[PDB]
Design a protein around this nucleic acid. Structure first.
Ligand code: ZN
Lengths: 98, 27, 19, 43, 112
RNA sequence: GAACGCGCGAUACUCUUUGAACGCACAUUGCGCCCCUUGGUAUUCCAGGGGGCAAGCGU
RNA sequence: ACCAUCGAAAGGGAAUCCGGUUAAGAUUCCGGAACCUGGAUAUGGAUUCUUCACGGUAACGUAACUGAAUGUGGAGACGUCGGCGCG
């Protein structure tokens, strides 16, 4: 005798980017320095491979400041420029001088 | 504007409609 | 419908050779 | 669950199942054009 | 007499971008893009606009309460009142006719 | 072989982006998944780093 | 039960406005004001004897007022023209 079942299936299925690499150099043009002294904003040059999180963290670690926001753009010469606005607890002129 | 930049060779030989390169045949 | 999908090809062939 | 065995009835049922599968395969493969369906209507 | 244009990337007169003209607190006429208007929900049986249900965009329904998009009656928010009444009456009459047919059948094979 | 950079590749007079070119797409620096780890209030969140993904009614 | 993926900067689509500001930047910057989505959570209130609330004949109303598998409905979502009414 064979003990076979009835209820069967209808279909069969088969059983190198750190804080020193992130920030290359600051921007020291007249407009950038005006923003530094007036707008409490540090203007930096960063790498092509860095995003706003990494730029914020690198600024915070390297300069020991609180970052309010980061606004990044890509320049025609293939470099990235970042405007890092710090909190009101810090004076950008002091950080630029220091 | 029948052709654009080819990634493999860098020439303006990538046919946009055919999606093939007339200089290096990519891909 | 197409109920043949209840048997894979190898099962169907090995049962056809039985006949 | 069925606890019973047959000698030749099982083979006959297997043959019938195979024949039904082949017939359904033929019908499905030949019904790819509507002309066959129209012809079958007057068949 | 001041002329205004689109404020976004699309430069064509498409249904997506439509312009109204408003006078800002600065004293000038400026363009403003208007969103698509919402559509009243419709009954699933007759297709008439549902009564007592707010008219919003598809994603704005997730931010309002259930009382703003339902009716306390059965099928409320899906079917209107007359359709529900018709459903009730039809179901009851169908069941009664089923009972009558079953009784007639029990009589007709009771002969043998 | 090509692109971008300082003969060479971010260690730039180790080896960026590619290319037979390999996670998937691609005329885009677009979109995912898996394992370890670190930081910011932190079991949940967010981010960074490293390393990967072209059974059978047969005997 | 049923097949990847590609294909639209004029199609579908969650959400930002005003004022000011440069030699050259603005719905992106500054000031003020506001929305959208996702997440973890706390407090108040309700869940009325202890266990998922009521009112109106009705259309329906509400500060809430649990809801799996499964099966459906709406918005997205749709030809063109004419006059009339309103902003
Ligand atoms: Zn109805």
């Amino acid at each position: 005798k064979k003990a076979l079942k009835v209820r069967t299936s209808a279909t069969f299925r088969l059983p190198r980017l750190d804080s020193y690499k992130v920030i290359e150099q600051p921007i020291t043009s007249e407009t950038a320095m005006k923003k530094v002294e007036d707008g409490n904003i540090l203007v930096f040059q960063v790498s092509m491979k860095a995003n706003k999180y990494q730029i914020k963290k690198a600024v915070k670690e390297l300069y020991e400041v609180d970052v309010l926001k980061v606004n990044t753009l890509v320049r025609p010469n293939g470099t990235k420029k970042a405007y890092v606005r710090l909190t009101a607890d810090y004076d950008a002129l002091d950080i630029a001088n220091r | 504007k029948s052709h654009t930049l080819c990634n493999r060779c860098g020439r303006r030989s990538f046919h946009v409609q055919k999606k093939t390169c007339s200089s290096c045949g990519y891909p | 419908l197409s109920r043949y999908v209840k048997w894979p090809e190898y099962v169907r062939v090995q049962r056809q050779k039985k006949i | 669950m069925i606890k019973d065995k047959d000698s030749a009835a099982d083979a006959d049922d297997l043959e019938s199942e195979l024949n039904a599968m082949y017939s359904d395969y033929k019908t499905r493969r030949s019904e790819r054009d509507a002309k066959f369906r129209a012809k079958q209507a007057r068949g | 007499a001041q002329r205004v244009t689109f404020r976004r990337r699309n430069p064509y007169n498409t249904r997506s971008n439509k312009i109204k003209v408003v006078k800002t607190p600065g004293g000038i006429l400026r363009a403003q893009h208007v969103k698509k208007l919402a559509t009243r929900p419709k009954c699933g049986d007759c297709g008439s606009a549902l009564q007592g249900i707010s008219t919003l965009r598809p994603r704005q329904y997730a931010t309002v309460s259930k009382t703003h998009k339902t009716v306390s009656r059965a099928y409320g928010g899906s079917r209107c009142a007359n359709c529900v009444k018709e459903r009730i009456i039809r179901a009851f009459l169908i069941e009664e006719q089923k009972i009558v047919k079953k009784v007639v059948k029990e009589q007709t094979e009771a002969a043998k």
